[PDB]
Design a protein around this ligand. Structure first.
Ligand SMILES: COC(=O)C[C@H](O)[C@@H](NC(=O)[C@H](C)NC(=O)C[C@H](O)[C@@H](NC(=O)[C@@H](NC(=O)[C@@H](NC(=O)CC(C)C)C(C)C)C(C)C)C(F)(F)F)C(F)(F)F
Ligand SMILES: COC(=O)C[C@H](O)[C@@H](NC(=O)[C@H](C)NC(=O)C[C@H](O)[C@@H](NC(=O)[C@@H](NC(=O)[C@@H](NC(=O)CC(C)C)C(C)C)C(C)C)C(F)(F)F)C(F)(F)F
Lengths: 329, 329
């Protein structure tokens, strides 16, 4: 130990959260720690909306370090919208802290059913400045420019359901989380953590695909046409009009995703992208895969990928490191 | 015979489609005939997306009546987006015709993976002018102004799978499609075909609910909070990651929707709204009740409702007629 950690807690097989706090009096919250966005928000005590009922709420008045701002903001996600206003106050992650600009959400009705169904309070973005609203410097970037950490990087070791918990480590790389070598891939842009890889599945290939490493996405996301050809004569049922794909867990035709570069080769075998749905039926699984088209052909390497591979997110060197995650700590 | 009858084909009691043409040659197409939108669109031959490759495409230069417009349009739906540009031509629906402004589509990826996985080419909207983009007067309104039909009204008798085909009748009500009395409900706005009903499922009551009668919605759609209360007295299986649920189709505890007004009482039993997934497991079903929040608390009575109830869409009298559909022609 030397860097600062944030324990990640598996939430009943789906998502993982981590705790951080806001205000010089602390005030704990539960966050989706999300490399796929770049704003921090937190539900306000001035929230009037149904979704806030079960949530930890933020009270600026109990904070001596609070600094009013009040500029209105709307925060858009694939899964919904959340509005409020900007504020500034001490944000604390691990036992690192800094004065930080963030959003006090007072309206969450555009974020249902997700927000009421989930136990997170807010979202802590870990992307790049250009992805943000209100041009906020990333937390880890600001910490390094204030010399509170050695390196402007952070690291994800995801929790696995029954096996172990996870860690978001800020400031340095720890050998204990991985096996074999790290391989680094340079970002094609400073926005999401997006790198370029050849994507190969069947005898289907997409050369030079834009791949986004996104901790806040619970699936592997794939281009629509690519997904469509992938499932051609696998024996997988797409329930009509739903992104709901069902197979025998044992289906011997299920392919392995292969993403390659000059530096390395990363695979995702069926065991990493399948979710058991035994309650639905015996020996049944669902593909934790969504079809999604971007302007440029794009995969999101979400949690199923990051469950297999320990990842390093390096702002200084503009790259992502990838290595096999240790099965047990 | 006397009115314009357009045959409807079933897909698995999930959705239905009907054909119509563009240009003075046939150039046939399969549409979602959709009371929940107010635009017509067809995929251009100038569309090269992977979805368009499997569809009937519209060649504007194989038809004398084409009149270019060229203006860009983004058509937005709850379930997806389609982009293209305005054009004008002869739209032939059944045995009637009219010069009509419509969208030639060149980008379909915003509506995938649904588009490619279904058999429709485009969407023919049957809503009101104010719901449209490009302020286009509805086909049926214009068809009445041109005295090609008796009444500015159309009618839906939806097909049911191993039982009968259906019909969209333009111009008048025909006794053969229903039994019992027709009951009229006034529109609360000239936008969607939206009326006001008290919605209750046994103690969960949402009085004066805004109810949209939408032929291009495959579900019953419901306020998120309302769905949560219904789920409280059920014990069904949540599909991981997705807002969908799996039941046995014969689950006796499944809710019967009740919708009352001064004028009448409408119910919808599980046998109408459930989506069978026999190919995943015997007796298995998707709930097919979908949480969806609008600015105003709203229900979408989609195909499940309209398979049970013959419906009448009356522009002249600003209302919706409802009657029990005949079980067989
Ligand atoms: C100016 O506006 C802009 O800067 C960009 C724009 O607003 C853009 N927004 C974004 O790109 C923002 C910043 N980031 C994001 O949208 C990406 C995040 O990782 C997001 N993730 C998501 O919304 C992802 N959703 C999920 O993972 C959810 N899980 C499920 O729905 C299960 C399915 C994926 C099977 C979780 C319960 C959250 C999808 C599949 C990508 C979450 F974590 F929720 F915050 C968007 F709205 F999507 F269009
Ligand atoms: C009032 O003006 C506005 O607010 C316009 C606004 O642009 C609005 N757009 C709309 O309301 C437009 C005009 N109409 C529409 O969106 C309603 C249409 O009936 C539409 N239907 C839908 O979008 C409905 N989609 C469905 O029922 C789909 N089914 C599934 O995805 C399965 C799910 C129900 C689980 C079909 C297979 C396509 C949803 C569930 C409401 C379809 F038919 F696809 F074209 C939207 F984009 F959603 F915000």
């Amino acid at each position: 130990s030397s860097n600062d950690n944030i324990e990640l807690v598996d939430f009943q097989n789906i998502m993982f959260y981590g705790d951080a706090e806001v205000g010089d009096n602390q005030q704990p919250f539960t966050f989706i720690l999300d490399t796929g966005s770049a704003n921090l928000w937190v539900p306000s005590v001035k929230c009037t909306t149904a979704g806030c009922l079960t949530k930890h709420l933020y009270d600026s008045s109990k904070s001596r370090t609070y600094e009013k701002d009040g500029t209105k903001v709307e925060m858009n996600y694939v899964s919904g919208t959340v509005s409020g206003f900007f504020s500034k106050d001490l944000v604390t992650v691990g036992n690192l802290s800094l004065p930080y600009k963030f959003i006090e959400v007072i309206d969450t009705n555009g974020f249902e059913p997700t927000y009421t169904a989930s136990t997170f309070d807010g979202i802590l973005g870990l992307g790049w400045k250009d992805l943000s609203i209100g041009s906020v410097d990333p937390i880890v970037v600001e910490l390094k420019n204030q010399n509170k950490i050695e390196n402007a990087l952070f690291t994800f070791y995801l929790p696995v359901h029954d096996k172990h918990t996870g860690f978001l480590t800020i400031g340095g790389i720890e050998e204990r989380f991985y096996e074999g070598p790290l391989t680094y891939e340079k970002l094609n842009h400073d926005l999401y953590w997006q790198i370029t890889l050849d994507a190969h599945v069947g005898n289907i290939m997409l050369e030079k695909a834009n791949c986004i490493v996104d901790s806040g996405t619970s699936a592997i996301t794939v281009p629509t046409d690519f997904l469509n050809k992938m499932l051609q004569n696998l024996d997988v049922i797409k329930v009509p009009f739903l992104p709901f794909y069902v197979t025998l867990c044992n289906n011997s035709k299920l392919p392995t995703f292969e993403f390659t570069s000059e530096n390395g080769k990363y695979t995702l075998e069926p065991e990493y992208y399948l979710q058991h749905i035994e309650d639905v039926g015996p020996g049944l699984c669902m593909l934790n895969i969504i079809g999604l088209d971007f302007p440029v052909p794009t995969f999101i390497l979400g949690d199923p990928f990051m469950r297999k591979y320990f990842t390093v997110f390096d702002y200084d060197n503009h790259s992502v490191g990838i290595a096999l995650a240790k099965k047990n700590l």
